Amino acid sequence: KKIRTSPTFRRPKTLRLRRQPKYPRKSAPRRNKLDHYAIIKFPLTTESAMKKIEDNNTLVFIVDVKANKHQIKQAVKKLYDIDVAKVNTLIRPDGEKKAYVRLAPDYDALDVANKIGII
Amino acid sequence: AKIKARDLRKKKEELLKQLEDLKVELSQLRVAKAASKLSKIRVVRKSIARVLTVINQTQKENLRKFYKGKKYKPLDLRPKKTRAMRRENLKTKKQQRKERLYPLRKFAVKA
Amino acid sequence: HKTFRIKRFLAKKQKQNRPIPQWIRMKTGNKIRYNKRRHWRRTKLGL
RNA sequence: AGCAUAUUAGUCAGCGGAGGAGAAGUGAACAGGGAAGAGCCCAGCGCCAAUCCCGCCCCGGCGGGGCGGGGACAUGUGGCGUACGGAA
RNA sequence: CCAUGUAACAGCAGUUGAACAUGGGUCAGUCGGUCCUGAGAGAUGGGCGAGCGCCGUUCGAAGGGACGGGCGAUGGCCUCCGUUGCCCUCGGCCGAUCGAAAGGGAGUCGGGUUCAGAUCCCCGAAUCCGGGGCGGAGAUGGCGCCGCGAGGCGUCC
RNA sequence: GCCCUUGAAAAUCCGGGGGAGAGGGUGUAAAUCUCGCGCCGGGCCGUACCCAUAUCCGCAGCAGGUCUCCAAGGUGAACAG
RNA sequence: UCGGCUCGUGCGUCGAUGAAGAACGCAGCAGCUGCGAGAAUUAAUGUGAAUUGCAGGACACAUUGAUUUCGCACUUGCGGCCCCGGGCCGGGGCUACG
């Protein structure tokens, strides 16, 4: 009751064990260094930034380059205890990343900016 | 009255709390960027460095106490002299018998 | 149309095209008198 | 004084591999004098797996001791012994 | 580039400048890349090679993936799927991979706004892809007790 | 019409054939080329400007060279002058 | 003349625990130099009141006390496996050949 139907010999499947290391190769996990305080460096305070603050309900920040929109949004929410509608990002020709964080309609970007220190 | 490592030598949660306070202070200083605050930027940065250094040293000394006596330990807890040094007095019974039967003698001449 | 690496190279080359701070002329052992300045038309980047 | 053998030259360039040293153990050698100085080990042939590697307990070149399981090994590990001889 | 300000350079000059100085400016699921393979480049097997390597690209035990069943997945403690080995079972070669900002490739438009950005910002109206509600669809139909009820029951189809 | 020239590939997407199966017992159940609504999400990188009798290459603000899109009236056959 | 050249002496120590080299970044206010998101340096020890171009260290008088990037691919492109947290997002650990 064992007949080869096909004329091709394939390599039979064999057991593949999961690793059970006798020691971790690293004593401790590497600490995350792109935390919320490292994500937002400082708010941009320029005439265009002030226009965005007072007209678009948008805060302008300079952020880390490796940060993405999800990380920037979460970091802003945690640092300033606020809600974010959306985040647009660009990388400036000097290499810094600039983020326009549009806040929720129920939040006044002017009051929040005053709390932060700008305007 | 800055932060000094001896005063930090404390539980992990309290050290993390102090680190978070320092991070908030540094963020406020960067937003502010007066002469006094512009000077405080470096003080707060070095205090952050000091607290993190104390945290890492405490963690690694605890890890070294933990893995002491174990045959296998993480590579960073293993001595790092030099790749060549990490890669002697055994004798065969024949050589041992040769040394025992014919040891080097202490002798003087012309006496 | 730029890549990320080319743009970062250009940003670094831009941040180096500024004059020396004036107060450096007041240091004790200062021999510099002005800035390795580059002009976009006079000298071309290594690309 | 051309040039092809020769010379340039086992040299430049090229490739591989180290160590604190390595390697050795036109046109040279031996003897002689110095610097230094140091000798040894297997296989094989014989006798007696006597050999090696890899959970628990006790003491910054991961070893030592005790206890118990797995493997290597008879297609040959270890001890004695290899030319100056060796064993009985 | 934009604004502001103002010896050398702009083969005369300049109250001007792509010059000099200071400070700003480039915002996307929908426009591209990213994905595809095209000529081709190039690993593994194999061969060659003193050797760094290079020849070769189909000339080797080259599948690691399939709804379905029981032991043990019990885990929420089994609705549906994170569970292992096996068969009842299937799964061929264009063997990895790279190669287009003009080729292929779903889906965003109108109005307004700046000193310098907008199919990217705002207002408005859409759309594509991926991931546990409501409605509709599956569809009310055909011996016989009361009934000429179009009443529900009783049964079968 | 012309070719002794016959004018990409793949990703990717869809229809069909077949029928293993699943569904519920008379009020529905399985299931929707997936039908109408409703809910959530779409990360990363580029994006300024010049694009050429001074922003590119030619040693330069050089009569050179450097791929494209749109393009009105008259005359006139006319993207001629 | 705080640089060379030449001679001599001692030592003679790189790297997957990831080197040499490269890139990017880091100062209150370009280069060189020094460093690595703890970035113009942290800790410790010794030393001892400076650093300095410019105001800006309560320097406990027990003067503790001044002086990163360079599993598959190279476009930050695309994954897979196991955990953790927040509800898909974020974090950690893995995943080269011989």
TrEMBL record, chain A:
Alphabetical UniProt keywords: Acetylation, Citrullination, Cytoplasm, Isopeptide bond, Methylation, Nucleus, Phosphoprotein, Ribonucleoprotein, Ribosomal protein, RNA-binding, rRNA-binding, Ubl conjugation
GO cellular component entries: cytosolic large ribosomal subunit; nucleus
One MF annotation (Gene Ontology) recorded for this entry: structural constituent of ribosome
GO BP term (any one): translation
Keyword Cytoplasm: yes
Summary of the function given for this chain in its UniProt record: Component of the large ribosomal subunit. The ribosome is a large ribonucleoprotein complex responsible for the synthesis of proteins in the cell. Binds a specific region on the 26S rRNA. May promote p53/TP53 degradation possibly through the stimulation of MDM2-mediated TP53 polyubiquitination.
Family under the similarity heading: Belongs to the universal ribosomal protein uL23 family.
Protein name: Large ribosomal subunit protein uL23
Annotated source species: Ovis aries (Sheep)
From TrEMBL, chain B:
Residues annotated as signal peptide: none
Gene3D superfamilies in the cross-refs: 1.10.287.310, 6.10.250.3450
UniProt GO cellular component terms: cytosolic large ribosomal subunit
Domain of life: Eukaryota
Keywords: Ribonucleoprotein, Ribosomal protein
Pfam families per record: Ribosomal_L29
CDD domains noted in UniProt: Ribosomal_L29_HIP (cd00427)
Gene Ontology biological process terms, A to Z: maturation of LSU-rRNA from tricistronic rRNA transcript (SSU-rRNA, 5.8S rRNA, LSU-rRNA); translation
Example of a GO MF term: structural constituent of ribosome
Subunit architecture: Component of the large ribosomal subunit.
Family according to the record: Belongs to the universal ribosomal protein uL29 family.
Protein name: Large ribosomal subunit protein uL29
